[PDB]
Design an enzyme around this catalytic site. Sequence first.
Site, PDB file in Angstrom:
ATOM      1  CB  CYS A  88     -37.123   7.000 -22.998  1.00 53.47           C
ATOM      2  SG  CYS A  88     -38.134   8.096 -24.067  1.00 53.47           S
ATOM      3  CB  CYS A 106     -15.248 -18.208  11.334  1.00 52.01           C
ATOM      4  SG  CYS A 106     -14.999 -19.959  11.479  1.00 52.01           S
ATOM      5  CG  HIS A 132     -41.684   4.763 -22.307  1.00 51.67           C
ATOM      6  ND1 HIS A 132     -40.663   5.464 -22.927  1.00 51.67           N
ATOM      7  CD2 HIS A 132     -42.553   5.695 -21.846  1.00 51.67           C
ATOM      8  CE1 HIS A 132     -40.903   6.762 -22.834  1.00 51.67           C
ATOM      9  NE2 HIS A 132     -42.043   6.930 -22.182  1.00 51.67           N
ATOM     10  CB  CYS A 134     -10.712 -22.039  10.623  1.00 50.95           C
ATOM     11  SG  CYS A 134     -11.642 -21.916  12.208  1.00 50.95           S
ATOM     12  CB  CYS A 184     -12.302 -19.280   8.738  1.00 43.95           C
ATOM     13  SG  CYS A 184     -11.655 -18.412  10.168  1.00 43.95           S
TER      14      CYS A 184
END
Lengths: 76, 315
Positions: free
Chosen positions: B13, B147, B273, B195, B192
């Site tokens: 099903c 960031c 079902h 960074c 980052c």
Amino acid sequence: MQIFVKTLTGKTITLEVEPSDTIENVKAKIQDKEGIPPDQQRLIFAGKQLEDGRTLSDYNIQKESTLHLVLRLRGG
Amino acid sequence: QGLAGLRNLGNTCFMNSILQCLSNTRELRDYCLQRLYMRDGSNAHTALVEEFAKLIQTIWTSSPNDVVSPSEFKTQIQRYAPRFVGYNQQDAQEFLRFLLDGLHNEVNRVHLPDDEKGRQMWRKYLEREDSRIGDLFVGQLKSSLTCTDCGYCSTVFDPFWDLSLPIAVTLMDCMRLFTKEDVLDGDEKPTCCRCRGRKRCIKKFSIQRFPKILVLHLKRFSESRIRTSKLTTFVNFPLRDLDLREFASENTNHAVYNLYAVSNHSGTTMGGHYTAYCRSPGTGEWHTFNDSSVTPMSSSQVRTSDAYLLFYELA
Ligand SMILES: [Zn+2]
């Protein structure tokens, strides 16, 4: 490189991976983070469900891509 | 007429529910009925698209209360997804994902502003994945990662063929949860790249390209120390005018959808079902498909807490 997973509640988590890492290795990391057993996780990216035995690079998953974590509602 | 039911071959099903939703996906149905597929691959195989199309052609040349057997079809999706070899209970969205991937593969034709980056990423994706099936389902997410220390916003663009939405309840609430500013801090702190260290960042999704057919998959699951369970929350979704403009990456980009099919699950994560509710392309009228049984229904009966996958078409 880093990728993200959007989890069941919509929280996002961050994984450090390599393109050559296997999807199973990724599910292992998710389990470390979220405690969902790997056999229960399904990860979807660009419409494909990621399969155990493949790597991230087979799916062209790039730095900062997001995988979408879902489980199953089995029925039949 | 298109109101033939599908024979349950043994816990199938989940499969029948998705096939009816696709049968009533207008452009996909037409593609099969005009056999544009023969015109149109990643390998030598075409039997999955052939049997899928013959199944649709049989449903649409059938008379009500005919029952159609998807036996030949099942044999072929199994070869793509061995998970489906047996007759165990399975997830309809997993099935939908492997099925569309298989169909797609068998007829596959193959420093900038953010806008421009997205458009170039998209081309790169279509250079690899380009089919009539994709034409219908594929969209593009933008993800912005900013960031909070240096303010750099790193943007990436991921294709999608559906969206899996956390449950916040209205459908829009769930879309807002999907697209919210996610604060990535503590153990989730990203590196980052400017960074070049781990920093609190904010990550946010928006929709850069909207698909012609938008499949929304409700994450009806909850992980707990105590138990993994199904979420049966009623999620109220519209029949018409689902307006997604607030989620678009570009201000104006209009994106309004109308519902045409729903795959329903009833049960737990471990068994249950499936049925489908589908709107006929021809008549606009809704019917319930519960395997071999097909009955008319009103669109006022379509929203229920059993909805698991929602099929919307772009207006
Ligand atoms: Zn920074």
